[PDB]
Design a protein around this ligand. Structure first.
Ligand SMILES: O=C(c1ccc(F)c(F)c1Nc1ccc(I)cc1F)N1CC(O)([C@@H]2CCCCN2)C1
Ligand SMILES: CCCCCCCCCCCCCCCC(=O)O
Lengths: 204, 191
């Protein structure tokens, strides 16, 4: 129903830029942003197998590892109409864990870059909270965004983006239980609408 | 010396597969000159950190790894006399572009009158494991080594609470013959 499970819920995610004068008037531009009773639509995981990095830690093996209900697809309409480039994430749990979070970027389904961080829990009002705030976006991505934003046509941006995906894998560090696996696929939004997203479940 | 400084020493390093097989192992010095490897790392690149100082913290290790052979694991273990919290960062680089960065932290455990920092059984990142299988199916040691001339790992341990760098190891890689096993050579990075 949302992006997450009973063990680990994604509270918030966002990738952004603050211009170098934000020390005078603060502003931040959101490339993409998720903030968090229908059930969610489904998408068949094999239909995107080729879009993620096969052999090991790619989609098929991860799904085979399960649990099957931990897998969500997120379709992003990015706002490229806008410095410090950042990513922030916030998850929450009933149990106290140490999370490992991996972010794999893949071009044409080949694992281009991978960031991996650990995050330990901080108590809160009835919940454990895990905050990975203001991760500085790696400059592969900032460069790709700059090159991408100067293309002359939306449809060209979207054909480029059809090869660019991101796989996020959150696991328990101690036990290696997979908690959350998210495939992201990307399209650019028209000027006037901001960023927007549609979350699906990955079934088989 | 060994691999370390007065504030922090490497006691154990091992990269292994269990079905245990050890690709590389250190258990516990001539100067190599840092510019000689500048073209091997990004430019987050080694010159940045070396300028940051302290240059007595920077080391180079050359591994001759053993690929003759699951769970793919990395275990490091450090030592200190001050109670610290380490941030250990690995960066795997291929052809100078940084293709993975893995970031962990370990807080000090008291033991035998010293502090041990044990980062044991990190799942080897998936890039490295795919790389290892591909590398292993090659038919000649010289082909492995040609491949491996473009692959390097860079480790920066820093004090978490202060951001001081404490340690900085560049790793370079070749394969050894089926007879000889793993071997390695630590070097001071100077300039
Ligand atoms: O910025 C991101 C990122 C992560 C997940 C996600 F769903 C995104 F949309 C992300 N950003 C992003 C990607 C494409 C466009 I067009 C706009 C965006 F805002 N990340 C993952 C990150 O950590 C990478 C992983 C690989 C190495 C480190 N940088 C930074
Ligand atoms: C640099 C390309 C790969 C080198 C191939 C040699 C085989 C042994 C690998 C040792 C890696 C040790 C550090 C890895 C950190 C991680 O777990 O990502």
């Amino acid at each position: 129903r949302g992006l997450g499970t009973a063990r680990l819920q994604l509270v918030e995610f966002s990738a952004f830029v603050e211009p170098p004068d934000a020390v005078d008037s603060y502003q931040r531009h959101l490339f993409v942003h998720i903030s968090q009773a229908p059930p969610l639509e489904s998408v068949d995981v094999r239909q995107i197998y080729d879009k993620f990095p096969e052999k090991k830690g790619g989609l098929r093996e991860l799904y085979d590892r399960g649990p099957p209900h931990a897998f969500f697809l997120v379709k992003f309409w990015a706002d490229l109409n806008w410095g410090f480039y950042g990513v922030s994430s916030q998850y929450e749990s009933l149990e106290h864990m140490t999370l490992t979070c991996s972010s794999k970027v893949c071009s044409f389904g080949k694992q281009v870059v991978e960031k991996v961080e650990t995050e330990r829990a901080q108590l809160e009002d009835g919940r454990f909270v895990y905050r990975l705030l203001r991760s500085p976006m790696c400059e592969y991505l900032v460069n790709f965004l700059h090159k991408l934003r100067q293309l002359p046509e939306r449809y060209m941006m979207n054909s480029v983006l059809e090869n660019f995906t991101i796989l996020q894998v959150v696991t328990n560090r101690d036990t290696q239980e997979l908690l959350l696996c998210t495939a992201y696929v990307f399209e650019v939004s028209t000027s006037e609408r901001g960023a927007q997203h549609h979350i699906y479940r990955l079934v088989r």
